[PDB]
């Protein structure tokens, strides 16, 4: 696992302001990035040319909070209260 | 686990927004992995095969 999985890359960007092309250096994963033409020292982001990459804000979280699907009025959600249920077929211990 | 102790680096593309990245790696450089008891796992595979059969 020493093919260059972590890569140290440089690039010029315009800042908050259009009066500064700051040559910045950052780190990338070998999968997250893809080379161009001959393998020079040059790469490009894995899907930059073909997609719209959006940095998920760090303020948010992907934690899997459990969830219940509460049913509306005049409707009902039933349950198979069996131990070993096939998945398809008739139930026996059923409840609302 | 991802064993690496990483450092946040906010490069501000702006105006009121920045792109965060790993500034550096504090310590050794290591590989991410997942540990599971092979006894538990393959004794679990025993559970499966009999109900697969």
């Amino acid at each position: 696992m020493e093919r260059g999985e972590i890569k140290n890359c440089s690039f010029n960007i315009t800042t908050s302001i259009r009066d500064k092309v700051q040559k910045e250096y950052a780190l990338f994963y070998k999968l997250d990035v893809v080379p161009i033409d001959n393998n020079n020292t040059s790469y490009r982001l894995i899907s930059c040319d073909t997609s719209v990459i959006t940095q998920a804000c760090p303020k948010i979280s992907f934690e899997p909070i459990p969830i219940h699907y509460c049913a509306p009025a005049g409707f009902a959600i039933l349950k198979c209260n069996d131990k070993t249920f096939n998945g398809k077929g008739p139930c026996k211990n059923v409840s609302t | 686990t991802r064993p690496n102790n990483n450092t946040r680096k906010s490069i501000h593309i702006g105006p009121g927004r920045a792109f965060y990245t790993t500034g550096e790696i504090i310590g050794d450089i290591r590989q991410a992995h997942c540990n599971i008891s092979r006894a538990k796992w393959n004794d679990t595979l025993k559970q499966i095969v009999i109900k697969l059969r």
Partner: antibody, heavy 132, light 108 residues
Framework: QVHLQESGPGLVKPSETLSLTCNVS????????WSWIRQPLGKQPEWIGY???????NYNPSLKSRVHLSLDKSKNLVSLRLTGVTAADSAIYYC??????????????????????????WGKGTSVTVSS | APTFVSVAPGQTARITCGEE??????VIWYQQRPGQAPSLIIY??????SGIPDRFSGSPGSTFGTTATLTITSVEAGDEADYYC????????????FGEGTTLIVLS
């Protein structure tokens, strides 16, 4: 009791090969990993390279093109041969056993360890001069 | 490094060496009495071979952003020498030339 001593010519013109030797006593020459070291007057010691019976033999990257090491079961010594010498090569050259260790920091399964050497007991020192 | 700390007998000497750490290092130490072969002092970072007392101790190669510090406790006369490092870092490649000859000198 275990100890050793090395020998040399003392002086060498800029051309030709600097050949050395290193007697061994108390322990066998095969069993140990051997390493030659040189140090100019005042300057810091400089690792030159190491060697084991199998021919497992790597050198300092700088002097790599010049240095040529070897052993011998009969004479039981450490035979260094530095070719194409220079004024800079004037130094005192030590002979020393080497002990090795594992330094596992991550997971042994996929490298994540480095192997380091240390030389436990040195010789006396052999002087070298490189003058016209 | 043309450096030399001066200490009094029965006092403590902090003799540092090498550049700052990156990964887990293993730093072997050496002592050089004037005109004598350098006796080995410590391996990897704090353990020592036969003959070296408990006065000697070193920086645990397990922290990052720290130089190699060799402590000589309650120093005496014979401890005077030129001390060196053989630095083995996880991220920085092999050191074939030794560290700086930090020269410890007693004061009394």
């Amino acid at each position: 009791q275990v100890h050793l001593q090395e020998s040399g010519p003392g002086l060498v013109k800029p051309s030709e090969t600097l050949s050395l030797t290193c007697n061994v006593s108390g322990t066998l020459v095969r069993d140990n990993y051997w390493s030659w070291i040189r140090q100019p007057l005042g300057k810091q010691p400089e690792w030159i390279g190491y060697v084991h019976d199998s021919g497992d033999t790597n050198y300092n990257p700088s002097l790599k093109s010049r240095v040529h090491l070897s052993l011998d079961k009969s004479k039981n010594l450490v035979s260094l041969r530095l070719t194409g010498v220079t004024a800079a090569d004037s130094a005192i050259y030590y002979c020393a056993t080497t002990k090795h260790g594992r330094r596992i920091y991550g997971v042994v399964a996929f490298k994540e360890w480095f192997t380091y050497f240390y030389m436990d007991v040195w010789g006396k020192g052999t002087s070298v001069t490189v003058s016209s | 490094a043309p450096t030399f700390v001066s200490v009094a007998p029965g006092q403590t000497a902090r003799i540092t060496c090498g550049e700052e750490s990156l990964g887990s290092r293993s730093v072997i130490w050496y002592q050089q009495r004037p005109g004598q072969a350098p006796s080995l002092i410590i391996y990897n970072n704090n353990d020592r071979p036969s003959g070296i007392p408990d006065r000697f101790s070193g920086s645990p190669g397990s922290t990052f952003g720290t130089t190699a510090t060799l402590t000589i406790t309650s120093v005496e006369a014979g401890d005077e020498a030129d001390y060196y490092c053989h630095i083995w870092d996880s991220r920085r490649p092999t050191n074939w030339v030794f560290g700086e000859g930090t020269t410890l000198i007693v004061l009394s």
